[PDB]
Structure 1
């Protein structure tokens, strides 16, 4: 995509994360593991579900239509009937394939932005209390226990609270 998160700053996805699309991984003295960001994932799902259903639901049902018999002196009309069917088939095939390709590209950019935005949310929370490393990770300069990890994920990190410790650990 155009935001550069998927197989970009993030080396690749997590096969160990099973409760969502976007999320976090953590490690501290009390344990480690993966957890999904339910708010980000559900919003991504609702957007995509509406997009898929829009493409399908806006299409009308194909109503009964069959070919027509023509006699041997009605070739001009038979050829007109065929022209109409071929023209409609060509229009719908071109549009169906091109629409899907255009929308698949946009879906992947949608996802690329959503994970990048999650990354920035944390960067803005942590400020100088952690450093950026590759693979989309923030390495803390202070002890961050399980209560801290939940606080960072929820967007409630009390930045100044940990600033004295990080200033010392940063040397």
Structure 2
């Protein structure tokens, strides 16, 4: 996306990873599997949660009754009332419409950014002890058993 991870250098997602939004998939001589990075997932959750809440909760509303009722000799103020309604009903339409369009773009980018920062987080630890296969993967130049795999996940990977 804006950060080139989703549908970017890491094209396609994992049906397999079912415990989070972003995460990993290791493969060593012991076996394989998916594991969502719990922190970045939890955080992204909290933020999007907070974002939705804001968009919803920031909406103020006064108790009111829109309709008005004017007679055949109050056409002018009827049209005025009409102007006010179509007026606000046109403001909120352009807003709701764009607010979503613009925010959706943001949210997608947010996720993309999160994936790229996670990728970059690992690529950091490993460094030379792994080769980058431009598909979102790293191939350890060494043996990395499950304790080792866990190591890199919880950010405690050794001498790089």
Per the shorter chain, which TM-score range?
Answer: over 0.9
Asked if structure 2 preserves the Cα contact closer than 8 Å seen for 1:127 and 1:159, the reply is no
Cα offsets for 1:5-50 (capped at 9, x unmatched): 0011112100001000000001111110000100010000111111
Runs of 4+ in 1 over 3 A off after TM superposition: none
Unaligned runs of 5+ in 2: none
Shift of 1:61: 3.0
Q: Higher mean Cα deviation, 67-76 or 106-115?
A: 67-76
**CA root-mean-square deviation:** 1.0
Matches of 2:131 and 2:56, distance apart in 1: 46
Shift of 1:62: 5.6
Shift of 1:99: 0.4
Q: May I ask how many residue pairs the two structures share in their alignment? A: 160
Q: Does 1:97 align with 2:97?
A: yes
Cα offsets for 1:36-70 (capped at 9, x unmatched): 10001000011111111100000023623131111
DSSP 3-state at the match of 1:159: coil
The two structures have a TM-score, normalised by structure 2, of 0.97
Larger CA Rg, structure 1 vs 2: 1
Matches of 1:25 and 1:38, distance apart in 2: 14
Shift of 1:159: 1.8
